[PDB]
RNA sequence: CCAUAGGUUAAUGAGGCGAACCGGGGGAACUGAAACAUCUAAGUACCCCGAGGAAAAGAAAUCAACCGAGAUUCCCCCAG
RNA sequence: UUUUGUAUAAUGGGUCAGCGACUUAUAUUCUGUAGCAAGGUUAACCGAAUAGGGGAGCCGAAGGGAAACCGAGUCUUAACU
RNA sequence: AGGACCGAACCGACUAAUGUUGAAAAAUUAGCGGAUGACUUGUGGCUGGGGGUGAAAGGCCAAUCAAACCGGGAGAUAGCU
RNA sequence: UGUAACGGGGCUAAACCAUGCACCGAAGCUGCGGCAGCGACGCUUAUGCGUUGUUGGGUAGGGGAGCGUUCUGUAAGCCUG
RNA sequence: GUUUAUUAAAAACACAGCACUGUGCAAACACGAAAGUGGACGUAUACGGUGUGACGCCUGCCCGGUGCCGGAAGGUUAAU
RNA sequence: AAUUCCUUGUCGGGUAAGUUCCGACCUGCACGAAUGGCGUAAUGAUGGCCAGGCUGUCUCCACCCGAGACUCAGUGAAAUUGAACUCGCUGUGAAGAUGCAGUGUACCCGCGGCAAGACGGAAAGACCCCGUGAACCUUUACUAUAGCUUGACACUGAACA
RNA sequence: CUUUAAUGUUUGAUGUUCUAACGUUGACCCGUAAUCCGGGUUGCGGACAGUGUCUGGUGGGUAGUUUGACUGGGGCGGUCUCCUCCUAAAGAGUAACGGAGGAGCACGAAGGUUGGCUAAUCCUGGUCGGACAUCAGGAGGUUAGUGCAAUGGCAUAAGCCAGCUUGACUGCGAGCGUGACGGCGCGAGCAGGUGCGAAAGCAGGUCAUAGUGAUCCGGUGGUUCUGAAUGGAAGGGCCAUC
């Protein structure tokens, strides 16, 4: 049968045109008046998924 | 069977000291000391930081150096 | 994704984002598929007919890449920048 | 953990607003500050308001 | 009281068995979730009823999208 | 065999003969190999039929962005040195 | 007269020894208790498993009981050997 | 439990200190022969042929190359009273 | 008298008796999706449950807690 | 004390001597009045203690009678078992050696006996721990629920105040 | 309007009686040769009761499950995150149920800037006034201070006074440090707009290092980005925030 996709990781991981990963950052849910501006700013953007932990997302998206 | 205690406790080691040393060919911005205090001083082309964190503000080699009349240690980065 | 029972990194990390359904009937489309139609006039259905976009589609842009050696009118779609000037410079004719 | 939050509003007509805490018990007085407000890339008068 | 219930004759039919498939009435838990209760397993196993050589469904108070298609059933895609 | 470590007085086996344990299916990725090559490939099905037909579709040649959208650029931002 | 007395049948099982791959998957020998009573026994019947029954020990329910047996889910699961 | 606190016999050096020359002593090193791996170099590769250095303990484990068995094709062939 | 058939026969269980409490009969209660049945072909001098355990002398204080019974003015409070 | 830790409490009795017994005291760790209190004749295959009789229980065993054991003939098992050419000692060492080292001793093989060792046999320790194992049981653990109960609507209507 | 009368119906509550539903494990008759049942007459009760759906309460009567780890064995006890010093072997790092202490905040000024200032303690003298208030001089030279623990710093003061103020700004960020990762941290400089200062300049919170909590779910404001026929909307997304 067919490979089924993390349903959760396909919505938290989008890939890119060399075949890495964006995600989103974490710590800006909430709690946000006692952060600093200069680390939420740093908290808005997108960043790529490091090579440690890009297999247990290959893992969880065979389809991309 | 019995006892206790009150001093299991430590905190976790912030890995301060001196990144880069003399001689040693740095980029704008790269930190050279992170310390507590001003335990160095910053001189030419170095700025501290909030924490009193020595960083190069131009391109070039590290001069250790202890000037003044306290014989203070300055950080300096050479030009090149 | 199993990291012992450490909160794994699909689940550490935060939701964005939601679904187009109109990217779904969008396409895009090479210049060098512009010389598969017959005709030299470009439709959704000419396409549809050579069998570069799909049925379901309702929304192409024609974009740079590869390249025309032939006059071909575009119909209806939507034009880059660099595609316009390449149709043009082949003699094309853009129109609605 | 008394200091509770609040929120300053732009006087600007936008809703744009400044989160911070304060002590309503030693600072009754409500707080008005001059903050910018990237909007209108201005800066305008802030005041107190609840952080609901 | 008529009547009705009931009774009796007669005629026709049924009853029971049987492998799977089928439609329906009821309907688990182990397990998985690295525990577990929502969830899953699974409308599965099992029990029951009825039928046929197949059954069931079926001829739009349907889809579509402002173009249009034109009952049901089955297969490949769509698409993990 | 398990172990830091067994002649171990740790486990197991009386002996022989026979059987006895990393498979199968479908998806996916990588390597090798072969075919074609900016293209490659068909499934169901038809067909008397391992041919041929069938390109429905799938992957790839363009990406960025949550998205609209723009497009070899795009996003961010009022705008980027 | 008697849930009276002694004591065989009969019912039971307090002690010791034997035996413990037994004669016997609980018995034999020597003693022991009740022995007209809440006795005992024959035949047949009824109560069914989270259920029965129980002068109640978690006792008994076909040499099996803190939930019988058989078949099925089922190749349960086993981060253990 | 039995000498039982040189391994024993035994030793007044066959003990200790100092100095010295010998010799024994390993699967170490060298010699002779043989196999294989990886690199150089040249050939002119049958893509391997000389020379050349050097390497060759090995569990878990990774990689590479093979033997044999049963069955199918080759095989209405070949072997076999 | 009974009891752990198969390591425990006892001080354990039961017992007559005592007390509390429920029950007015289509009784309570119990087995049963229900119909029904037992109680009981009985009717409070009866039946069920609980505790104690012949007989003799006795059974003292506490209702704050937890239960149960009774109350219904007020507060709170569901579907609707 | 079927309850008393300290405790063999103290005193008395009984005995040559009595952590038990009996009777007292009360300082009841931590009795107590129907999860009954204190007494109680009779009974008990009941528990503890004492005495008389009796005796191989014992001092301390002796002899005898029989059934086996032993020998012959016939039939003929079993558990167990890596392989055995299966000594002692001291030491060593997966830390308690038939098997190693050193040394000592010892011709080969049976039979009857004993049982010190083979960490002997039997039963994948019942103790202990662990397992994100199980089961049963409890409760003012959690979540449900049968059951009991409340009210609303329906089956369910008419009058009068 | 405040303060209200008539009539009537729309109607609830509470009684009052009735009978026709319903009940009858009351009597009698018939089916019938029958203590079931049904039908019929009657009596009693009577819209109660009782059943169905909904609902609140009670509910170990029953069922499904949970009931942590470290641990010089387990339990008991203690601990579990963060900061500071030692152990730590002169870079970083480094364990124990090792030795000692703290934190889970505070501040609209205790922030920014400009300007200025410089302590502790003791000695002498001096009204109430005293070991110790305030005052004047001298020694001393930071033995003080730092919002709070410790360590490192601090005189150009980072310590103490006053003036003006909100940079406790928004978008970014070369380049580095630290982590397995998630993440955490430092940061010159650029654009915009601002404060102080004559100006050079400084300011993107506090001398630094503790003062904290992922995701999901959900709430609030803003934004047409999306909007399942179309136009909207709901909902979702993005930004801020709880
Ligand atoms: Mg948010
Ligand atoms: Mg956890
Ligand atoms: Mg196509
Ligand atoms: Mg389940
Ligand atoms: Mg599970
Ligand atoms: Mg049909
Ligand atoms: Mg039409
Ligand atoms: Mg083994
Ligand atoms: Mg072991
Ligand atoms: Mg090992
Ligand atoms: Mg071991
Ligand atoms: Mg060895
Ligand atoms: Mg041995
Ligand atoms: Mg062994
Ligand atoms: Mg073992
Ligand atoms: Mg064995
Ligand atoms: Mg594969
Ligand atoms: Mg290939
Ligand atoms: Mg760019
Ligand atoms: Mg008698
Ligand atoms: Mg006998
Ligand atoms: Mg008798
Ligand atoms: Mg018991
Ligand atoms: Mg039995
Ligand atoms: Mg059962
Ligand atoms: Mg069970
Ligand atoms: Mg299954
Ligand atoms: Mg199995
Ligand atoms: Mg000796
Ligand atoms: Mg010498
Ligand atoms: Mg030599
Ligand atoms: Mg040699
Ligand atoms: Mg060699
Ligand atoms: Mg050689
Ligand atoms: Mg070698
Ligand atoms: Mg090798
Ligand atoms: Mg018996
Ligand atoms: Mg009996
Ligand atoms: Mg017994
Ligand atoms: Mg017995
Ligand atoms: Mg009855
Ligand atoms: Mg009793
Ligand atoms: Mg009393
Ligand atoms: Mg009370
Ligand atoms: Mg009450
Ligand atoms: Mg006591
Ligand atoms: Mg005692
Ligand atoms: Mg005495
Ligand atoms: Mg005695
Ligand atoms: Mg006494
Ligand atoms: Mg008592
Ligand atoms: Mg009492
Ligand atoms: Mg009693
Ligand atoms: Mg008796
Ligand atoms: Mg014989
Ligand atoms: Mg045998
Ligand atoms: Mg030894
Ligand atoms: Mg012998
Ligand atoms: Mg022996
Ligand atoms: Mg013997
Ligand atoms: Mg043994
Ligand atoms: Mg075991
Ligand atoms: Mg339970
Ligand atoms: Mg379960
Ligand atoms: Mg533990
Ligand atoms: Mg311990
Ligand atoms: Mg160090
Ligand atoms: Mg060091
Ligand atoms: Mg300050
Ligand atoms: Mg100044
Ligand atoms: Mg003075
Ligand atoms: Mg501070
Ligand atoms: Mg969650
Ligand atoms: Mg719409
Ligand atoms: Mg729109």
Redesign the interface.
């Known amino acids: 049968p067919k490979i089924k996709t993390v349903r959760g990781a396909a919505k938290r991981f989008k890939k890119t045109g060399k075949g890495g990963f964006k995600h989103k950052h974490a710590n800006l849910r909430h709690i946000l008046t006692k952060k600093a501006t200069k680390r939420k700013r740093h908290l808005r953007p997108k960043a790529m998924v490091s090579k440690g932990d890009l297999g247990l997302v290959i893992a969880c998206l065979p389809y991309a | 069977a019995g006892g206790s205690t009150r001093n299991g406790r430590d905190s976790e080691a912030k890995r301060l000291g001196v990144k880069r040393f003399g001689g040693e060919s740095v980029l704008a911005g790269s930190i050279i000391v992170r310390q507590r205090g001003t335990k160095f001083h910053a001189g030419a082309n170095v700025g501290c930081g909030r924490d009193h964190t020595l960083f190069a503000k131009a391109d070039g080699k590290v001069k250790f150096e202890v000037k003044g009349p306290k014989n203070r240690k300055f950080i300096s980065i050479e030009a090149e | ?1 199993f ?1 012992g029972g450490q909160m ?9 984002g939601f679904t187009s359904r109109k990217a779904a009937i969008t396409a895009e489309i090479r210049l060098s598929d512009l010389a598969k139609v017959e005709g030299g006039v470009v439709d959704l259905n000419t396409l549809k007919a050579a069998n570069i976009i799909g049925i379901q589609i309702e929304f192409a842009k024609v974009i740079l890449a590869g390249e025309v050696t032939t006059p071909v009118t575009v119909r209806g779609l939507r034009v880059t920048k660099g595609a316009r000037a390449a149709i043009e410079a082949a003699g094309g004719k853009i129109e609605e | 953990g008394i200091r509770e939050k609040i929120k300053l509003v732009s006087s600007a007509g936008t809703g744009h607003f400044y989160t911070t805490t304060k002590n309503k018990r030693t600072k009754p007085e409500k707080l008005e500050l001059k903050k910018f407000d990237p909007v209108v890339r201005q800066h305008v008068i802030y005041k107190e308001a609840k952080i609901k």
């Open positions: 994704g990291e794994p990194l699909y689940r550490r990390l935060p939701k964005f």
